[PDB]
Amino acid sequence: KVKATGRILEVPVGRGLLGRVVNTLGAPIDGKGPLDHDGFSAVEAIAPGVIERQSVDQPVQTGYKAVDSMIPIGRGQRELIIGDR
Amino acid sequence: MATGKIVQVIGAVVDVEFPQDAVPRVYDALEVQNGNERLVLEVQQQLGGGIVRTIAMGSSDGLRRGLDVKDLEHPIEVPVGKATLGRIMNVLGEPVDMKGEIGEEERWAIHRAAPSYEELSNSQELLETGIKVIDLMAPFAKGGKVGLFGGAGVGKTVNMMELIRNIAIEHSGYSVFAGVGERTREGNDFYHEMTDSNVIDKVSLVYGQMNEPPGNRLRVALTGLTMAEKFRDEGRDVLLFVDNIYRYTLAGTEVSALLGRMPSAVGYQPTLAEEMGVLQERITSTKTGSITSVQAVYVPADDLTDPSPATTFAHLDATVVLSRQIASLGIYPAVDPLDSTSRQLDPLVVGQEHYDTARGVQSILQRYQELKDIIAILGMDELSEEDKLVVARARKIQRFLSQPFFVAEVFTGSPGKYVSLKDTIRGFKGIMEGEYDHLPEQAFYMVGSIEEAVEKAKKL
Amino acid sequence: TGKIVQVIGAVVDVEFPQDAVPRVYDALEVQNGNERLVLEVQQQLGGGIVRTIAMGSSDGLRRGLDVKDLEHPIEVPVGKATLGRIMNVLGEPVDMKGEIGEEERWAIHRAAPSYEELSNSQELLETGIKVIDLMAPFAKGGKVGLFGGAGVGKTVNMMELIRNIAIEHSGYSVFAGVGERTREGNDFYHEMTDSNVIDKVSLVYGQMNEPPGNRLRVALTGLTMAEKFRDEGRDVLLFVDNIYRYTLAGTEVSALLGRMPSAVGYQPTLAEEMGVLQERITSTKTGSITSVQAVYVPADDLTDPSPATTFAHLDATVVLSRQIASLGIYPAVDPLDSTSRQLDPLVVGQEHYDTARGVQSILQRYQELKDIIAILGMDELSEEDKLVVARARKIQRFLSQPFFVAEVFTGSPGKYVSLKDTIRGFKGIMEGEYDHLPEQAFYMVGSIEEAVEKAKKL
Amino acid sequence: GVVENLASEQAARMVAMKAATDNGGSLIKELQLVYNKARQASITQELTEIVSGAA
Amino acid sequence: IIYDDLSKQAVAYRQISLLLRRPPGREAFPGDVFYLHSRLLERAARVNAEYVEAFTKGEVKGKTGSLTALPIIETQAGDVSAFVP
Amino acid sequence: IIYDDLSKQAVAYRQISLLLRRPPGREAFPGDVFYLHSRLLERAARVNAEYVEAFTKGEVKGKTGSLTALPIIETQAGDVSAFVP
Numbered sequence A: 001k002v003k004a005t006g007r008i009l010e011v012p013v014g015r016g017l018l019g020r021v022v023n024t025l026g027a028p029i030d031g032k033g034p035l036d037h038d039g040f041s042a043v044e045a046i047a048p049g050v051i052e053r054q055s056v057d058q059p060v061q062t063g064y065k066a067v068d069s070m071i072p073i074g075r076g077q078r079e080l081i082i083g084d085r
Numbered sequence B: 001m002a003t004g005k006i007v008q009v010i011g012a013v014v015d016v017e018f019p020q021d022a023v024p025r026v027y028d029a030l031e032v033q034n035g036n037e038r039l040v041l042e043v044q045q046q047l048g049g050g051i052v053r054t055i056a057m058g059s060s061d062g063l064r065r066g067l068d069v070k071d072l073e074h075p076i077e078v079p080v081g082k083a084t085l086g087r088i089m090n091v092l093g094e095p096v097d098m099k100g101e102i103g104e105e106e107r108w109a110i111h112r113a114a115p116s117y118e119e120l121s122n123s124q125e126l127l128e129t130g131i132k133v134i135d136l137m138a139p140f141a142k143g144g145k146v147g148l149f150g151g152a153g154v155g156k157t158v159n160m161m162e163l164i165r166n167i168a169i170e171h172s173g174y175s176v177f178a179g180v181g182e183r184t185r186e187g188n189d190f191y192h193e194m195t196d197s198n199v200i201d202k203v204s205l206v207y208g209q210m211n212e213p214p215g216n217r218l219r220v221a222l223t224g225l226t227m228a229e230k231f232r233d234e235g236r237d238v239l240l241f242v243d244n245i246y247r248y249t250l251a252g253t254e255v256s257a258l259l260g261r262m263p264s265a266v267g268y269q270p271t272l273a274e275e276m277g278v279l280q281e282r283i284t285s286t287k288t289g290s291i292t293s294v295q296a297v298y299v300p301a302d303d304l305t306d307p308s309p310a311t312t313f314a315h316l317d318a319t320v321v322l323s324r325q326i327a328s329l330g331i332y333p334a335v336d337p338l339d340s341t342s343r344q345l346d347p348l349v350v351g352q353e354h355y356d357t358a359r360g361v362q363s364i365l366q367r368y369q370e371l372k373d374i375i376a377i378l379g380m381d382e383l384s385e386e387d388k389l390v391v392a393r394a395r396k397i398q399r400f401l402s403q404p405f406f407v408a409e410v411f412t413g414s415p416g417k418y419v420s421l422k423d424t425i426r427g428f429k430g431i432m433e434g435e436y437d438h439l440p441e442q443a444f445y446m447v448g449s450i451e452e453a454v455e456k457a458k459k460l
Numbered sequence C: 001t002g003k004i005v006q007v008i009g010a011v012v013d014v015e016f017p018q019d020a021v022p023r024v025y026d027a028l029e030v031q032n033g034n035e036r037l038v039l040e041v042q043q044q045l046g047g048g049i050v051r052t053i054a055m056g057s058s059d060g061l062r063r064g065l066d067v068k069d070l071e072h073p074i075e076v077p078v079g080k081a082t083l084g085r086i087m088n089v090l091g092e093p094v095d096m097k098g099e100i101g102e103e104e105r106w107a108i109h110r111a112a113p114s115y116e117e118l119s120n121s122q123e124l125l126e127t128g129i130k131v132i133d134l135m136a137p138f139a140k141g142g143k144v145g146l147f148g149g150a151g152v153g154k155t156v157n158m159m160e161l162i163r164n165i166a167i168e169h170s171g172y173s174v175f176a177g178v179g180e181r182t183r184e185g186n187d188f189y190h191e192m193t194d195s196n197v198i199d200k201v202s203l204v205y206g207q208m209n210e211p212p213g214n215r216l217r218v219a220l221t222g223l224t225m226a227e228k229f230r231d232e233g234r235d236v237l238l239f240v241d242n243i244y245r246y247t248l249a250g251t252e253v254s255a256l257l258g259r260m261p262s263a264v265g266y267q268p269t270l271a272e273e274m275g276v277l278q279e280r281i282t283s284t285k286t287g288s289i290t291s292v293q294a295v296y297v298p299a300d301d302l303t304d305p306s307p308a309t310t311f312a313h314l315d316a317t318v319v320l321s322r323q324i325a326s327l328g329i330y331p332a333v334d335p336l337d338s339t340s341r342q343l344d345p346l347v348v349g350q351e352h353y354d355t356a357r358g359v360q361s362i363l364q365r366y367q368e369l370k371d372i373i374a375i376l377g378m379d380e381l382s383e384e385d386k387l388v389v390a391r392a393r394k395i396q397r398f399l400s401q402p403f404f405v406a407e408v409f410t411g412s413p414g415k416y417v418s419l420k421d422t423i424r425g426f427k428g429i430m431e432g433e434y435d436h437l438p439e440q441a442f443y444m445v446g447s448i449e450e451a452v453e454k455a456k457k458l
Numbered sequence D: 001g002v003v004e005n006l007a008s009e010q011a012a013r014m015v016a017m018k019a020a021t022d023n024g025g026s027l028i029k030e031l032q033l034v035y036n037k038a039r040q041a042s043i044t045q046e047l048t049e050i051v052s053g054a055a
Numbered sequence E, F: 001i002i003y004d005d006l007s008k009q010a011v012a013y014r015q016i017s018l019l020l021r022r023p024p025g026r027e028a029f030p031g032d033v034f035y036l037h038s039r040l041l042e043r044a045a046r047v048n049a050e051y052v053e054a055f056t057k058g059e060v061k062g063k064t065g066s067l068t069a070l071p072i073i074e075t076q077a078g079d080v081s082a083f084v085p
């Protein structure tokens, strides 16, 4: 028998996750005890619309001279790292 | 009253069963409550007894088998008219700018037939643009279709923002921007740019971004046309900018197999050419009014042979092929002068000096290309003197095609340049006639008119 | 209790009553003529039918036969009993000696160790092979992979590693022959038992003559013994003869199990099947499994989905190649694809790190020069370019070495080279100390000194 | 001595160009085999995927 | 946020899709592999201070939040023409 | 024993495998073409005297049998790197 809990997949979220190794379902695997989450959130949500955005003018520093001079990244950008193995 | 029930929900495709009388016809709309969310479905097939297979115009998540469906007996209908100017809308013509209701007077169905063969109107009223290479190699008339072909990152968007600046501000007529499958950031950046420049009062914007389910990306192009066609039927001259024709075809590919269709040559849908035709044959200038359109065309993998770019080449009056090589070499705009052309490049309709200059430029650059691998292996010393001459003039010509844009100033830190058509001819003819043979190559790079080439040459 | 309803090649469908249908990996038994056949359940279909894979020859089975439902997985002997002996995929003895006197049997479908249980050690291990511990040195407890096509030397190199790394390892070792030539097994068994080291090496052999059930589960009964020895606290060496054949048995079976084909024709579960196998083979905090695996690439195609999903699972990948072999340069190790996680100056030292990068920089530049030379010849090169072409050719010759296990095919006496000798040799060539010696002096020699002597007699 | 060295130069150039002609033919005959094998694989990867999709 | 291997996700989704018998596309990937990665990546964004203030019910004012993403892809032998790249 | 061509046995098996609608692999050969040749060729062997005594039930004693087998393969334009070779 299978019951249908009418709820979508939600994940522990908060500040207490900083420093924790966690599996996809939110179970800690580092073994350092339970989480301290600030409630749950849903895994599958929709993104902010056009009117809700703001343009990108703040840098995020790689620390690598080649990247940060020739291929700069800003706070909100979506940079792809591609190549071989 | 509600009249149908959902019987399948596989991914983005929803099947609805109705009584065998009054089954919804193809391209009709349907409505279902996805919880609190009103969800629209569009009918794509009448299959079997009483069943219709449909695409969700929204997320398919949260749907159950057995939900009630209500059939609206019309296609998706959108606001059209002046009330659409200055407003962002989605595929359904609902405001996404949070300024309130559209306030439309009239609403029009997005599925309509193209103009009849006797309605089409001939034109050769050449537009002038600031861009040297385009106005030399691919000038285009008012009422024509222009396509910008390129792979990823070659300058399609920067070119289209430049052309919007140069053409639309002189244009006194209303314009439509259709953001098919655009990046949401780029849509916001455009909206703010127009809002600051105060040209937002003559542009209507329809945006269907990448994140939206396939039906939105599929149908948003037709809402753009339906607005432009309303302005054309009022008799206006309209500017229609379409951000990617490719992601209309791709939005068709994603859903095609779930609609039961057998796959075609490169995994595309079997109906690729008809789907392209039915859309692109509406974008025409009739006797009542003219639509002028600029389309960007993504080129998957940078191969111009892929079915999708290959078919759309046959619909366009001018085709500006951008190339990744020229962009990688750092020459901007990355237009390939050998591949790009226009049907308005005729000695009869341009000035015959223009035509002669264009034929010269193309002949020279073609003659350089074949020499390239010879020099690379056997070396420059094993050219002859008249080839060493034509290889130099080729390099000078290939620098003088480059240009700074006002919208590509943020990237490079330099002012933007607008060159008049006459100055462009005068410069390229002078270079080919050798009046500037003694100047270095950098004296032509990233400059405006040839008078600016001699001023920078003096500084050099 | 159940009855056979379909026999499609290697897969067998059995119909059970509605209330006692076997679990997803249980084993069943049939009398196929005079012989007993074990079946392993793979899928529960509806109506009490299960699809099974036959662990033996499927010929002779008739529809309507009666199967017997055992209520446990395939369980194999483990430990000190399985230590001098050759065993089958079912864990039966395959040598003609008597029964295995085991105290315990483990099911072969187990779970990989948890994240907190793992252990990471940088304690570097030394091989006599010059190129392997120069270019891609591997440490104790990490997985080593020997790639390459057909005839490029995977097995001869592995027999060399078995010979040399057993010098500094005292504990037990497990050898798993997964779908390879039987003769190579028989030769290994007699070579081990003639050196009296058979009391430590434990052998499992499901070879390439066996049906696709036997070549699918033999790698897992290899690991189940290595995992028994790891959980006793021991450091274990695990050798796998070919770990392409485990994925090939899945490709042969997975059409008849009803799964739709994926890329090329691989099963859709290729990356999970490899991940379920190659994640239970690790060093935990209570043992350590040093493992060498030979990975056949099909058709010399390093972009094929079976090798390309194995490069992420290994610590030290050694890519053999056919062209280098055609030149006679055994071991035919391509130094521009072989790499390691342990090639870092913080673990391996700066002098070694700098030597290995110097070698890569030269041989890459030589590759760039080869296309110019091919059309024009060497005469149009710059004089610096001629200097690098001469040193790169000498370096390629010096990468070769004469193995003790290859003494039969060639006749040259074998050689073991220490790390300090090999870094001294390559450092000396790179800075041109040896610019005065002919190229053929460097071919098939051990330490640099030997090359000078060879040069004297040309 | 100069006139004789120029005659020697022309003989050495003709021998070099003859070698470069034969090596270019040798590359053409091998690149063509790579190309033919590639077109055949491309033709079999498709069709396999159209029959699998037709299902 | 760094997505380690959007390639191996694409491979996992392909496995799920085929086991469910959905119709295969090019290289056997389902067609909604573009929809998978696009709905994922367009979630990384910068949002204006009005959105932040609306979301936090007035608690935080005067701040634009941001999420930056660095997806990684592996190509085989540098082939960019493959489907997922 | 001299198998005069195993590359027209592989073809005559590919035909049977494609008439039975079995999914093809590389060069459209079936997935089990390797088993096809491995089962056949691994039957060529040298067997020890204990096996001959056990098989003949002691009527032959102290002799070792063998079956040498030299298969022929034809390859197109002389490359060894094809799948069946």
Ligand SMILES: Nc1ncnc2c1ncn2[C@@H]1O[C@H](COP(=O)(O)OP(=O)(O)OP(=O)(O)O)[C@@H](O)[C@H]1O
Binding pocket: C149, C150, C151, C152, C153, C154, C155, C156, C157, C296, C330, C331, C332, C401, C402, C403, C406, C409, C410
């Ligand atoms: N030093 C050497 N190293 C490797 N191979 C050598 C060497 N000297 C000669 N050879 C020849 O290379 C042959 C092939 O090597 P090997 O049997 O390891 O192939 P393989 O890598 O096992 O490939 P496969 O098992 O897939 O046929 C050896 O049988 C031998 O004839």
Ligand SMILES: Nc1ncnc2c1ncn2[C@@H]1O[C@H](COP(=O)(O)OP(=O)(O)O)[C@@H](O)[C@H]1O
Binding pocket: B150, B151, B152, B153, B154, B155, B156, B157, B158, B159, B332, B333, B405, B408, B411, B412
């Ligand atoms: N004319 C130009 N001047 C300076 N940079 C340019 C120019 N054209 C393109 N680029 C650079 O290349 C990028 C990619 O082109 P863009 O039009 O933004 O995307 P796409 O070409 O894919 O539509 C630009 O964002 C910019 O970084």
Ligand SMILES: [Mg+2]
Binding pocket: B156, B157
């Ligand atoms: Mg763009």
Ligand SMILES: [Mg+2]
Binding pocket: C154, C155
């Ligand atoms: Mg081998």
